[PDB]
Design a protein around this ligand. Structure first.
Ligand SMILES: CCCCCCCCCCCCO[C@@H]1O[C@H](CO)[C@@H](O[C@H]2O[C@H](CO)[C@@H](O)[C@H](O)[C@H]2O)[C@H](O)[C@H]1O
Ligand SMILES: CCCCCCCCCCCCOP(=O)([O-])OCC[N+](C)(C)C
Ligand SMILES: CCCCCCCCCCCCOP(=O)([O-])OCC[N+](C)(C)C
Ligand SMILES: CCCCCCCCCCCCOP(=O)([O-])OCC[N+](C)(C)C
Ligand SMILES: CCCCCCCCCCCCOP(=O)([O-])OCC[N+](C)(C)C
Ligand SMILES: CCCCCCCCCCCCOP(=O)([O-])OCC[N+](C)(C)C
Ligand SMILES: CCCCCCCCCCCCOP(=O)([O-])OCC[N+](C)(C)C
Ligand SMILES: CCCCCCCCCCCCOP(=O)([O-])OCC[N+](C)(C)C
Ligand SMILES: CCCCCCCCCCCCOP(=O)([O-])OCC[N+](C)(C)C
Ligand SMILES: CCCCCCCCCCCCOP(=O)([O-])OCC[N+](C)(C)C
Ligand SMILES: CCCCCCCCCCCCOP(=O)([O-])OCC[N+](C)(C)C
Ligand SMILES: CCCCCCCCCCCCOP(=O)([O-])OCC[N+](C)(C)C
Ligand SMILES: CCCCCCCCCCCCOP(=O)([O-])OCC[N+](C)(C)C
Ligand SMILES: CCCCCCCCCCCCOP(=O)([O-])OCC[N+](C)(C)C
Lengths: 69, 69, 69, 69, 69, 69, 69, 69, 69, 69, 69, 69, 69
C-alpha cells in the first residue's frame, strides 16, 4: 500500500502548500490595497513567506516520491 | 489501492487548488472594488499568487498519474 | 476500488470546484453591488478566477474517469 | 462497490452544488436588497455563477451514474 | 453495501438540500426585514434559488432509490 | 447493514432538518425583533422556508424506512 | 449491528434536536432581551420553531426504536 | 456491539445536551447582564429551553440504556 | 469492546461537560466583569447552568461504568 | 483494545480539560485586563470554573485507569 | 494496540496542551499590549492558567507511558 | 503498527506545536505593531509561551521515538 | 504500515508547518502594512517565529524518514 503512502502525503502537502500561499498572498493583496506604496516591500515579504511555507510541504512531496520509488 | 491512491491525491489536490485560487481571487476582487486604480497591480499579484498556490497541487496531480500507472 | 477511486475523486472535485466558484462569484456580486461601475472588470475577474479555480478539479475529473475505465 | 461508489459521488455532488448555489443566491438576495436598481445585473450574475458552480457536481453525477451502471 | 449506499446518498442529499434552503431562506428573511417593499422580489429569488439549489440533491435521491431498488 | 443504513439515513436527515429549521427560525426571530410589524410576513416566509427545507430530509426518512423494510 | 444502528440514529437525532433548540431558544432570549414586550410573541415563535425543528429528530428516534425492537 | 452502541448513543447525547444547555445558559447570562430586570423572564425562558433541548438527548440515553440491558 | 465502549462514553462525556462548563463560566466571568453588581446573580446562574449542563454527561459516565463493569 | 480504550478516554479528557480551562483563563485574563479591581473576584470564578470543568475529564482519566489497570 | 494507544494518548495530549497554552498566552500577550501596567499580573494568571491547563494532558502523557511500558 | 503509532504521535505533535507557536507569534507581532515600546516584554512573553506550549508536543515526540525504537 | 506511517508523519507535518508559517507571515504583512517603520522589527519576529513553529514539524519529518529508512 505504497500508493496510499504517496496519496495522503502529496495530498496533505497539496492542501498545506496551497492554503498557506493563499493566506500569504491574500494578506499581500489586502496590504497593497490600503498601502500601494508598500507594494514592493509587501511583495518581498510574500516571496520569502511562501518560500518558508512551502519548505516542509515540498519535503513531504519528496518523501511522497520516496514512498512510491 | 492504486485507484484509491490516485483518488486521494487528485481529490485533495483539487480541493487544495480550487479553494486557494478562490481565496486569492476574492482578495483581488475586493481590492479592485476598493481601489480600481490598483486593478493592474492586484491582478499581477493574483496570477503570481495563483501560480505559487498551484505548484504543489499540480505536483500532487502528476503523482496521482504515477500512482495510476 | 475501481469505483471508490472514481467516487471520492469526482466527489472531492465537485466540492472543490463548486465551493471555489461560489466564493469567487459571491465576491463579484458583492463587489458589483458596492461598485456598479466596476461591473466590467469584476466580471472579467470572475471568469478568469473561476477558470483558474477549475483547473485541478477538472483534471481530478479526468483522472476520475480514468479510474472507471 | 459500485453501490457504495455511486453514493459518495452523488452525495458529495449534492453537498457541492446545493451549498454553492446557496452561497451565490445569498449574495444576490443581499445585493438586490441594498441595491434594487442592480437587480437585473446581479440576477444574471447569479445564473452564470450557478451554472459554472454546478458544472463539476453535474459531471460528478454523471460519473456516479456511470459507477452504478 | 447497497443499503449503506442508498443511505449515504440520501443522507448527504438531505444535509445538502436542507442547509442550502436554510441559507437562502435566511437571506430572504433578512432582506425582507431590511427592505419590506422588496418582499415579492426577494421571494422570487428564493424560489428560483431553492429550486436550483435543490437540483442535484433531488438527483442524488433518485440515485439513492436506484441503489436501494 | 440495513439497520446501519436506516440509521445513517435517518440520522443525517435529523441533522439536516433540525439545523435547517433552526437557521430559518433564528432568522425569523431576529427579523421579528428588528422589525416587529413584519411578524406575520416573516412567519409566513418561515413556514414556506421550513417546508422547503424539510423536503429532502422527509424524503431521506422514507428511504430509511424503505431500507429497514 | 442493530445496536450500532439504533445508537447512531438516536445519537445523531440527539445532537440535531438539542443544538437546534439551543439556536432557536438563544435567538428568543436575545430577542426578548432587545424586545421585552415581544416576549409572548417570540416565545410562541420559539415553540412553533422548536416543534418543527424537533419533528424529524423525533422520527429518527422512532426509527431508532424500530431498529432495536 | 451493545457496549459500543450504548457508548455512541450516550456519548453523543452527552455532547448534545451539555453544549445545548451551555448555549442557552450563556444567552441567559448575557441577556441578564444587559437587562437585570429581565432576570425572572430570562431564567424562566432558560428552564423551558433547556427542558426542550434535553428532551431528545434524554430519550437517547434511554435508548442506549435499553441497548445495554 | 466494553473497554472501547467505556472509552467513547467517558471520553465524549468529558468533552461535553468540560466545554459546556467552560462556555457557561466564560459567560459568567464576562458578565461579572461587565456588571460587577450582578456578581451573585450570575454566579447562581452559573451553578444552575453547570448542574443542568453536567446532567447528561454524568449519566454518560454512569453508563460508561455500566459498560466497563 | 484495553490500550486503545485507555487512549481514547484519556486523550479526549486531555482535549476536554485543557481547552475548558483555557477558555476560562482567557476570560479571566480579559476580565482582569478591563477590570483589574475584580482580579480577586474573577480568579475565584476561574478556580471554581476549572474545578467544575475538570470534574468529568478527571473521572474520564479514572475510567482510563480502570480500563488499563 | 499498545503503540496505537500510546500514540492517541500522547497525540491528543499534545494537541490539548499546545493549543490551551497558546490560547492563554495569546490572551496574556493581548492583555499586556492593551495594559502594559498589568504585565506582571497577567503573567501570574498565565502561569497559573497553564499549570491547570497542562494538568490533565500531563496525566494523559503518564498514562500513554503506562500503556507503552 | 509501531510506525503508525510513531506517525500519529509525531504528526499530532507537529500540528500541536506549529499552530500553537503560530498563535503566540501572531499575537506578539500584532502586539509589537500596536505597541513597539513593549517589544521587549512581548518577545520574552513569546519565548516563555512557546516553551510552555512545546512542552507536551516534545514529550509526544519523545514517545514517538520510544514507540519507534 | 511503514508507508502509511511515513506519510501521516510527513503529511501532518506539512499541514502543520505551512499553515503555521502562513499565520506568522500574514501577521507580519498586516503589521508592516499598518506600521511600515516596524518592518525590520516584525521581520525579525517572523524569522524567529517561523524557526520555532517549524521546529517540531521538521522533527516529525525526520521521524517520517526514520520510518522509511
Ligand atoms: C447503578 C445502576 C445499576 C443497574 C443494574 C440493573 C440490573 C438489571 C438490568 C439487566 C442487567 C443485565 O442485562 C443484560 O446485560 C448483559 C450485558 O449487556 C447482557 O446479557 C446477555 O449476554 C450475557 C453475555 O455473557 C449473557 O450471560 C446473558 O445471559 C444475556 O442475557 C444483555 O445485554 C442484557 O440483557
Ligand atoms: C480529508 C479532508 C481534507 C479537507 C481539507 C479542507 C481544507 C480547507 C481549508 C480552508 C481554510 C480557509 O481558511 P481562511 O482562508 O483563513 O478563511 C476561512 C474563513 N474564515 C476566516 C471565516 C474562517
Ligand atoms: C472540504 C472542503 C472545505 C472547504 C472549506 C472552504 C471554507 C472557505 C474558504 C475561505 C474563503 C475565504 O475566506 P477569507 O479569505 O478568510 O475571507 C475574506 C473575507 N474578508 C476579506 C472580508 C475578511
Ligand atoms: C463535504 C465537504 C463540504 C464542505 C463545505 C464547505 C463550505 C464552506 C462555505 C464557507 C462560506 C464562507 O464565505 P466567504 O466567501 O468566505 O465569506 C466570509 C466573509 N466573512 C469572513 C467576512 C464572514
Ligand atoms: C456537510 C457540511 C455542510 C456545511 C455547510 C456550511 C456552510 C456555511 C457557509 C456560511 C458561512 C458564512 O459565510 P457567508 O454567510 O456566505 O458569508 C457572509 C459574508 N457576508 C456577510 C459579507 C455576506
Ligand atoms: C454532517 C452534518 C454537518 C452539518 C453542518 C451544517 C452547518 C451549517 C452552518 C451555516 C451557518 C451560516 O449560515 P448562513 O445562512 O450562511 O448565515 C450566515 C450569515 N452571516 C455570516 C452574515 C451571519
Ligand atoms: C452533527 C453535526 C451538527 C453540527 C451543527 C452545526 C450548526 C452550525 C450552524 C449554527 C449557527 C447557524 O446560525 P444562523 O441561523 O446561520 O445564524 C448565524 C448568525 N451569526 C453567525 C451572526 C450568529
Ligand atoms: C459531532 C457533533 C459535535 C457537536 C457540534 C455542535 C456544534 C454547535 C454549534 C452551535 C454554535 C452556536 O450557533 P449560533 O449561536 O446560531 O451561531 C453562533 C456563530 N458564532 C459563534 C460565530 C457567532
Ligand atoms: C466533540 C465536538 C464538540 C464541539 C463543541 C463545540 C461547541 C461550540 C460552542 C459555541 C458557543 C457559542 O455560544 P453562543 O450561545 O452562540 O453565543 C454567541 C454570542 N454572540 C451571538 C453574541 C456572538
Ligand atoms: C474531539 C475534540 C473536540 C474539541 C471541541 C472543542 C470545541 C471548542 C469550542 C469553543 C467555543 C467557544 O464559544 P464561546 O467562547 O462561548 O463563544 C464565543 C462568542 N463570544 C465571544 C461572544 C463569547
Ligand atoms: C481531536 C483534536 C481536536 C482539537 C480541537 C481544538 C479546538 C480549539 C478551539 C478553541 C476555541 C477557543 O474558544 P474561545 O477562546 O472561548 O473563543 C475565542 C474565539 N472566538 C471568540 C472567535 C469564538
Ligand atoms: C488535529 C487537531 C487540530 C486542531 C486545531 C485547532 C486550532 C484552533 C485554534 C483556535 C485559536 C483561537 O484563539 P483564541 O485565543 O481562542 O482567540 C482569541 C481571539 N480574540 C481574542 C480576538 C477573541
Ligand atoms: C487538521 C488541523 C489543520 C490545522 C488547523 C489550524 C487552524 C488554526 C487557525 C487559527 C486562526 C486564529 O488565529 P489567532 O491567533 O487565534 O488570531 C485570531 C484573532 N485575531 C485575528 C483578532 C488576531
Ligand atoms: C487535514 C485538514 C487540513 C485543513 C487545513 C485548514 C487550515 C486553515 C488555516 C486558516 C485558518 C486561519 O487563517 P487566517 O488567515 O489566520 O485567518 C484568520 C481569520 N481572520 C481572517 C479573521 C483573521
Amino acid at each position: 500500500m505504497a500508493f496510499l503512502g504517496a496519496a495522503i502525503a502529496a495530498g496533505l502537502a497539496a492542501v498545506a502548500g496551497a492554503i498557506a500561499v493563499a493566506i500569504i498572498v491574500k494578506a499581500t493583496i489586502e496590504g497593497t490595497t490600503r498601502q500601494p506604496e508598500l507594494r514592493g516591500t509587501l511583495q518581498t515579504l510574500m516571496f520569502i513567506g511562501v518560500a518558508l511555507a512551502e519548505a516542509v510541504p515540498i519535503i513531504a512531496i519528496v518523501i511522497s516520491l520516496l514512498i512510491l520509488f
